[PDB]
Design a protein around this ligand. Structure first.
Ligand SMILES: *[C@@H]1O[C@H](CO)[C@@H](O)[C@H](O)[C@H]1NC(C)=O
Ligand SMILES: [Zn+2]
Ligand SMILES: [Zn+2]
Ligand SMILES: [Zn+2]
Ligand SMILES: [Zn+2]
Ligand SMILES: [Zn+2]
Ligand SMILES: [Zn+2]
Ligand SMILES: [Zn+2]
Ligand SMILES: [Zn+2]
Ligand SMILES: [Zn+2]
Ligand SMILES: [Zn+2]
Ligand SMILES: [Zn+2]
Ligand SMILES: [Zn+2]
Ligand SMILES: [Zn+2]
Ligand SMILES: [Zn+2]
Length: 335
């Protein structure tokens, strides 16, 4: 069985501030994190941004969301984007005020930052289970200094961020996770890990978990079989537990931009299809000794496509703000 049965619900506070209330499987209005907790979710992933101009996903935002997560009995995974806005393989902008010219200065800013985030959580008695040093960092982070022209710099920054967490006053130190996209692509994963470890600046002991994104709708090569091989290879090569920290499956996808992978093409687009997909993903992870799955943004009703070419990847119907049956998939898999 999976250790982490998770969801990323970072959008929740913004959706609430836009007037969204969610109706549960009992037909009752209920706080979204309590709906999840009562339906088998035991951990919540939260994106953190450094100095966003409108406050979205900033430190205060995340402290309040984490308090609610903890009140609901769930563990907290902080996904540090180390940017003022979305960090992904096509965007890794250095925060306003941080250095774009001096790697020594930037390394100290990253260290100070992750220490300050963690000590803010400690000071407020919020335990955190996992922290990622960056989001989807296969093409580096904190550009231009942390681009793939300078893997030596990337290693320094990861080292610094990780030790900021290790030096924090949290009573139990979080597991430190490194997160790359394209989890199904073993050669890409291997190239990154082998290269940052060879610099001499990142220690093999600096991180505890390897996390990957896994989506079915951006590339037909994303078969479950390739994911299985990649996860197996990651665990055996680097000696770290592995998990899927982002995934989605559509209830509606009328005009996909990319063909779906061959071993997933019989799964329907529906709530039942979401469950079948997740059940197969969970079995796949179990087979290989993987430890978690986090569903990405199940309740983001203003953004049902979640950035993909599909109409709707949510576990909540935007038309009536009511959860779909797939919201209980993790509980269903127990039982
Ligand atoms: C890191 O924080 C310390 C305060 O403990 C401060 O003295 C120092 O200037 C900071 N480093 C950078 C580069 O901002
Ligand atoms: Zn299972
Ligand atoms: Zn608010
Ligand atoms: Zn982007
Ligand atoms: Zn300097
Ligand atoms: Zn760049
Ligand atoms: Zn450069
Ligand atoms: Zn360099
Ligand atoms: Zn060091
Ligand atoms: Zn590749
Ligand atoms: Zn450590
Ligand atoms: Zn992503
Ligand atoms: Zn919204
Ligand atoms: Zn509906
Ligand atoms: Zn079910």
């Amino acid at each position: 069985a999976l250790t982490y049965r998770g969801a990323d619900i970072s959008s929740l506070l913004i959706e609430e501030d836009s007037g969204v209330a969610y109706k549960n499987l009992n037909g009752e209005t209920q706080a979204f994190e309590l709906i999840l907790a009562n339906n088998g979710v035991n951990s919540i992933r939260q994106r953190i941004w450094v100095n966003p101009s409108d406050g979205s996903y900033n430190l205060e935002y995340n402290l309040e969301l984490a308090k609610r997560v903890q009140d609901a009995g769930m563990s907290v995974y902080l996904d540090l984007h180390l940017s003022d806005t979305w960090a992904d393989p096509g965007d890794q902008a250095t925060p306003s005020g941080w250095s774009t010219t001096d790697i020594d200065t930037l390394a100290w800013q990253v260290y100070n930052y992750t220490l300050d985030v963690c000590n803010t959580f400690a000071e407020n008695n919020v335990a955190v289970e996992i922290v990622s040093i960056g989001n989807e960092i296969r093409n580096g982070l904190l550009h231009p200094l942390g681009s793939t022209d300078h893997y030596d710099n990337i290693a320094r920054l990861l080292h610094s961020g990780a030790w900021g967490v290790k030096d924090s006053s949290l009573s139990t130190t979080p597991k430190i996770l490194f997160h790359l996209d394209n989890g199904w692509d073993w050669d890409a994963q291997k190239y990154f890990y082998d290269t940052v470890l060879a610099t001499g600046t990142l220690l093999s002991t600096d991180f505890d978990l390897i996390g990957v994104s896994y989506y079915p709708f951006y590339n037909a090569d994303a078969t479950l079989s390739s994911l299985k091989t990649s996860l197996t290879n990651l665990k055996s090569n680097y000696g770290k537990n592995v998990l899927v920290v982002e995934t989605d499956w559509p209830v509606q996808c009328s005009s996909p931009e990319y063909a779906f992978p061959s071993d997933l093409s019989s799964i329907p687009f529906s709530a039942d299809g979401q469950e079948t997909f997740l059940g197969r993903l969970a079995d796949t992870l179990e087979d290989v000794g993987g430890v978690g799955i986090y569903y990405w943004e199940p309740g983001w009703v203003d953004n049902a496509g979640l950035g993909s070419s599909c109409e709707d990847n949510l576990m909540v119907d935007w038309r009536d703000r009511t959860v779909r049956e797939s919201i209980s998939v993790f509980g269903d898999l127990a039982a």
